Amino acid sequence: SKPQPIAAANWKCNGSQQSLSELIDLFNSTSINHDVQCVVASTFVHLAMTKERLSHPKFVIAAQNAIAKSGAFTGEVSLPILKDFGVNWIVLGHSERRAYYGETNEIVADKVAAAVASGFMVIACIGETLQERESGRTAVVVLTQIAAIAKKLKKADWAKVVIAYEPVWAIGTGKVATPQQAQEAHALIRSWVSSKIGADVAGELRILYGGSVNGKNARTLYQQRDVNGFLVGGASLKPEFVDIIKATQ
Amino acid sequence: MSKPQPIAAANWKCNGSQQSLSELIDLFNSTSINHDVQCVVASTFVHLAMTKERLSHPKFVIAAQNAIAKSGAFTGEVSLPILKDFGVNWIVLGHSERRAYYGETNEIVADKVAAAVASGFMVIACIGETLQERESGRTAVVVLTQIAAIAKKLKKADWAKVVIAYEPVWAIGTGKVATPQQAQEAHALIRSWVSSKIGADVAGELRILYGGSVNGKNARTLYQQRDVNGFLVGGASLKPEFVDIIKATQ
Numbered sequence A: 001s002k003p004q005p006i007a008a009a010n011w012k013c014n015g016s017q018q019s020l021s022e023l024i025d026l027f028n029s030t031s032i033n034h035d036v037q038c039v040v041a042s043t044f045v046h047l048a049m050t051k052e053r054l055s056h057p058k059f060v061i062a063a064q065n066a067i068a069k070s071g072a073f074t075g076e077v078s079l080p081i082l083k084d085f086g087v088n089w090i091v092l093g094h095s096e097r098r099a100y101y102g103e104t105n106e107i108v109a110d111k112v113a114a115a116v117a118s119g120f121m122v123i124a125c126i127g128e129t130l131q132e133r134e135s136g137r138t139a140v141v142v143l144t145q146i147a148a149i150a151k152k153l154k155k156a157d158w159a160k161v162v163i164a165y166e167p168v169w170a171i172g173t174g175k176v177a178t179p180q181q182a183q184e185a186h187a188l189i190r191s192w193v194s195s196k197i198g199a200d201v202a203g204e205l206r207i208l209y210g211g212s213v214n215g216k217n218a219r220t221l222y223q224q225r226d227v228n229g230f231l232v233g234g235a236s237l238k239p240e241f242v243d244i245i246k247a248t249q
Numbered sequence B: 001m002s003k004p005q006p007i008a009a010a011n012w013k014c015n016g017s018q019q020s021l022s023e024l025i026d027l028f029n030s031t032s033i034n035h036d037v038q039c040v041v042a043s044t045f046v047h048l049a050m051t052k053e054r055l056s057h058p059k060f061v062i063a064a065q066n067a068i069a070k071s072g073a074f075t076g077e078v079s080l081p082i083l084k085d086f087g088v089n090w091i092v093l094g095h096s097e098r099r100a101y102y103g104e105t106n107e108i109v110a111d112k113v114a115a116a117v118a119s120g121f122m123v124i125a126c127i128g129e130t131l132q133e134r135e136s137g138r139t140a141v142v143v144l145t146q147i148a149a150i151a152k153k154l155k156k157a158d159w160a161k162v163v164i165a166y167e168p169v170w171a172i173g174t175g176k177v178a179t180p181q182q183a184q185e186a187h188a189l190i191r192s193w194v195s196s197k198i199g200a201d202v203a204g205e206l207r208i209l210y211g212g213s214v215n216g217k218n219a220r221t222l223y224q225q226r227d228v229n230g231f232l233v234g235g236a237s238l239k240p241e242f243v244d245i246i247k248a249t250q
Helices: A017-028 A044-053 A079-084 A095-100 A105-117 A130-134 A138-151 A155-160 A179-196 A199-204 A218-223 A241-246 B018-029 B045-054 B080-085 B096-101 B106-118 B131-135 B139-151 B156-161 B180-197 B200-205 B219-224 B242-247
Strands: A006-010 A037-041 A059-063 A089-092 A121-126 A161-165 A206-209 A229-232 B007-011 B038-042 B060-064 B090-093 B122-127 B162-166 B207-210 B230-233
Touching: A006 A206, A006 A241, A017 A044, A017 A241, A037 A089, A044 A059, A044 B045, A044 B080, A059 A121, A079 B045, A089 A105, A105 A121, A105 A138, A105 A155, A121 A138, A130 A138, A138 A161, A138 A179, A155 A161, A155 A199, A161 A179, A179 A199, A179 A206, A179 A218, A218 A229, A229 A241, B007 B207, B007 B242, B018 B045, B018 B242, B038 B090, B045 B060, B090 B106, B106 B122, B106 B139, B106 B156, B122 B139, B131 B139, B139 B162, B139 B180, B156 B162, B156 B200, B162 B180, B180 B200, B180 B207, B180 B219, B219 B230, B230 B242
Parallel strands: A006 A037, A006 A229, A037 A059, A059 A089, A089 A121, A121 A161, A161 A206, A206 A229, B007 B038, B007 B230, B038 B060, B060 B090, B090 B122, B122 B162, B162 B207, B207 B230
Antiparallel strands: none
């Protein structure tokens, strides 16, 4: 099966003009032989330079967050502005936003619906914490997270959605996630989609692993039947990202 | 003191199109500004590049509408270090919208301000009381408390990089109207507070901007007020009328 995989770089709140230009030079000189969607999500400030310097056709740029409408919201950026600016991809509901910025399942769901409605390709993040994992609550939590989003879309909307599974429980907790655990979580997600939305949708849906990925463990990870790529953190700001992209063949 | 250099700051908020902003910047570049005035344009993060490249009027500087103190694992946000790297030296912090919708408390605002000043930025720090606080005769306590929070984190010398913006939150979208007298009154209390706690030298040089509802028709009367040193403009800043606002600071 395997739908087209995605290798998304989440630069988070980082980068210098010098540092990012160098990485982008690296990326533009990289030979990519397979069918893969590479995505670079830089901070808002760097969207301009990225759009101008990244010429590799296998790459697309995306934003790391947004609000649904323009208006009196000092400091924020809305979908319309992004769209006007030529951005067609966006990452929403990232664990960091859910944890530090008050984004609940419902707000995340509203942002996604708005994004899809506006023509964006969306990378919607989901994942359970240590506590929820240890109490055997993974299925309940993740499925609830996904149901929220689903509640707002039409079957056809799924074509623009990408699900990113973040093992929040394994991030900064001292716990290590295994490729098997990742696969288990992805399968649970896909099964749900198949049963609640449709097998056609489920068969085409890309589900990315958003845990700790590096050049060393990426291939092992992509090998699993339900892993369709990665939403990478730290490694994405390094040349090693190329290795990660290569691991999706 | 005679009045310090005034500031006319445009807070574009979450708005703008490449086309619309381009026209506006064209307008601004073609405007003659005779007096000593610092003009500031705070666009969304996305539009900083284009603003920085097209705004050539020597009287204008660009600014960000918000930031976090450090870089790191904070998806969606922008840090001071990044803005600095990008050549942005001015920033608006603690806006009422951020305080109301995005969890910014006096202390969070204070930390941001301090980090900003330490990084070499000129900061426009926003303060202001709500309807409820106003009606209960609590204006002085509230605004004074907000400023003290900021003050607790700076040293005398740091004040040279701070600009206070007074937002009459109680008059914003509440159906109430602020008058030039109420504005002057709020600004005067702030100044006296600075004079007493920080120093008179600091107080005479400190710019205190008015951030309520300002337009081309009421700007002049507001600027006339002894303690008003300029404006932090909302909706009118996305319009040609912003030019009238700048001229009123003469």
